[model samples]
Target: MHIDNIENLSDREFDYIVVGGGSAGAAVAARLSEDPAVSVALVEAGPDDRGVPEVLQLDRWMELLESGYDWDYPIEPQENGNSFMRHARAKVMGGCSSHNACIAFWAPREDLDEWEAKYGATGWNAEAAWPLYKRLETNEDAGPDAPHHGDSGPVHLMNVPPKDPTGVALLDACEQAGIPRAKFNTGTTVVNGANFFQINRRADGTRSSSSVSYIHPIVEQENFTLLTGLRARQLVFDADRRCTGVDIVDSAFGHTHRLTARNEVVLSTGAIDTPKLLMLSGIGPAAHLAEHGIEVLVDSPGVGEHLQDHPEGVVQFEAKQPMVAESTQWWEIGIFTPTEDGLDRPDLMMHYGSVPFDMNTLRHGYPTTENGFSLTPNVTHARSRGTVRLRSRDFRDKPMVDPRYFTDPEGHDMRVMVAGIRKAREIAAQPAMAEWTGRELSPGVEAQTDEELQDYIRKTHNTVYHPVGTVRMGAVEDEMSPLDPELRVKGVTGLRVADASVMPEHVTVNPNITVMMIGERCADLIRSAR
Candidate 1:
């Protein structure tokens, strides 16, 4: 049941209070509400996504970018990369899951294992995360009898077969270029392969976002209360320094209200907002908080540090025939490969778009062909890091998101980008793509040298919009880590963070599924402890 009136919930308290009804927040709220004995309150900054066709329909995702439903955060100027790109964060119930391409990937075992072995994120290894991923999806391609797939789950996953002629040719070209066709999310790592993306879309052709999958069915449950259009302004703590509730501002009216958490408060806001909330409540670095005239509560320096994202560069070519069909989702196929030899995992990934994605390239006067297709290659795990800091003390003001792109010390990121463009060109040159391929449109056939490629990549580089590691979790001994292994804030009690913000490092693939898995794990942790 949704509570539109703030007066009804002003002094009331629930057993569990979940903030942000995005991908991870919806999962946390839905799972905890399963226990009929306890009441759960879910607070979302945005409105309900029920009647929104642009968000529910799978093919209309592109329309949500920069729309009224988007947070539309701007990036600070990157000295070495394109500074004109804007970050689109959905201000809807489903968050970015409702706005993104809906591509799904199981978090690779190599990535999960590294979180335990290297980053001190114990119990977060592949062994622990596997069951959660299985519990969150009902694979349409791999049926119930399939070994590694779930029979029944909230989220639906379907294999999008190649329907467009260009899509079919791209897949054939990938295979001809030494990239084999393989089944994804089959409990094994696929370092080099191409395949149609398994998306989170239902059989009805609607997006199965976290909110649609988890919360919609249980919306009428007596124990659950969903509060929409309530933006959290600050965290409220008790006399003993235990986080008890939050101060939320009503978007329609300027009035403020409090929603207390009787047992625990879980922050499921994404990377950018999660850390910003903590800093606003005086849990960040002492010096920074003091500069903003906020009293320091924890002096935790890792609150908004260690920002990471996937930097993408596009390669476009004029298609000989119509590339996109009337009924399509633009991004259908994906290719993964290592940029160099001896790497444990594929560091480079490319998404084949059946449309002319000339958003970034247009700035440099790149020609916009009428019938064009693009292959966007990006660094899966970029070495460069950045930061998100407060623009002011006001929660209404957007934070300064500075993702210092391609600034890695060893220039490993730039090297991967260069290799990715070369790989795209190699695939385009294959015999399978001979009939569909046309003249190079972006960099043109003239730009061949490494230096030239590097310059072009820097000028036109874009983010995949995967930001993480702002409020990361790790072992108890790591001072830089803000949260402990159980996703608990080190200096606070009765509070936990379950979102992309807690990711110690970026997952090799799109991270929507992994973030939902984190929500599942967080609910389990809370239930088991009780």
Candidate 2:
């Protein structure tokens, strides 16, 4: 009941315990406890955020920008952006899925094909993981016609009502830009093009997150205990270097919690926190933790490394749609294309909306004032790689995230964004965009030069809200990598990391689905091991 920080912490243990209640954590807990025979405990650092109306409403997910659902961590001063910016991670129950723009596009099989080759990750390549993806999504249509999507699973993956203007216009713009639209989740020969994102919401516009769609369905059972407000401080290790329990702290009461795991301990704390907990538990770089005066249990140099995410180009377009005035239902329209020649897959992706979602500005200035202003943001989903490392062993300290945004230098930054920016300009230049009082709002014709565009990017290179790669999994025993191909942490027994953290590289798609896939695969592995 308390933080479980009992003075004598070694005694507490359970059958299976999951740390973090984010996307993958919730899914893993739900799927693992389906047996109903073993005791499954889920710990969440933040409480359930369903009480926030904006967070619960499907269209208002982005409205929780500065709200409580978001951990609202910012980066350190970068040489480029002048300083740090808002890097919102969902701190509440459903995790980032609760506070994100709910954009849903399945992982391209080709992009996901690198798991076994470059990373040595097993059961994650396109051909091997397809079945797991299908089993994870219970679609509205379960026919075998589309290899990309499904009709049945615990998750409800669907496009928003077709009339959201920005959502519709994005598809139209993509087609006009000569981009081919494809179905969801096909291994190959599928359309890696413009499509409406399948939000984590039901038909009634209610959230269908892990807590809603997965956990709630099974919470009433006796064996499953959902613990919230208890922050996981570390993974408890036995004398033999086995992870057998978890150490927690109650932020409210400052009490201690020690929950032991009989069978195994799974770290589902997403990418950042997964590594955060790992390092805190003494499983990171040897020299770094020693500098912090902490004992080292495992010398996994890769505990906090290889961070990557989708950074956004906030291309403002004057829209003809009254999306802001009419209380428009939020919907995302996406584009998939390539920026360079070497990459075979579509590297550059764009997301256009009917309103100006001012991501560049911090806090919309209202307790309730959220995403509005007819926003269309061009997002480059992946190719921007970064790193995450601990500031200290302190769980409260924000992890240092260095997302070297334009590192590739092959105009990787300029070219990819300009491509999406051009697409945004095309949408605004369209005849259909002449309906509502419209004009070019941002990156104006005056800012057409590469220098001016780069300046704009520096001033406003906002996060597309995807962060992963810390504690990356790889095939070979990398001195810097954290986990093995099976998502198991090296030298740590009875503990496996089954979340976005284990993704050795970017999913090259919206990570929510990929995180769920990880949880799904984790559930199978855990179940089979039992």
What lDDT score belongs to each candidate, Candidate 1 first?
A: 0.89, 0.69
Off by over 4 Å in 1: 8-11, 143-145
lDDT of 2: 0.69
lDDT at 500, model 1: 94
* Global Cα RMSD, each model: 1.3, 3.7
Q: Candidate 1 lDDT, tens digit per residue, 1-530?
A: 78876777654688989999888999999999999999999998888899889999989999888899899989898978888878889998978887888999998899999998989998989988888888899987556556678858899998887687878888899889889997888888779998988898998888989999999899889999989888998999977889999989887358877888889999988999999999999898889999899888898999999999999999999998776666447888889988788977799999988888888888798898878888899999999998989988989899999889989999999999999999999999898999999988988888999999998998887788899999999989988999999999988899999999999999999999999999999999999875
- Winner by TM-score: 1
**What tens-digit string does per-residue lDDT give for candidate 2 at 1-530?**
22323453333556998888778888888888878778788888877654657766766766677777677777766665525477888887778777766665567676677787767776568765677668767665456676556667777766555666555655665576666676544455233466655565677777677677677667667678777777888778878888889878877448666788899888988877788778788888888889887799988877776778777776654444446444224445566766556666666666665556555633322111233333334344445566677887677888887777766545465566766676566655555344542555555566777777777776767777778888777765567667776667888789999888887777666788778878888888888873
Q: Name every residue pair that clashes in candidate 1.
A: none
User: What shift in Å separates residue 292 of candidate 2 from its native position after superposition?
Assistant: 1.2
The C-alpha stretches of model 2 lying farther than 4 A from their native spots are: 1-12, 49-52, 82-84, 147-149, 165-170, 186-192, 324-329, 341-343, 361-384, 409-411, 432-437
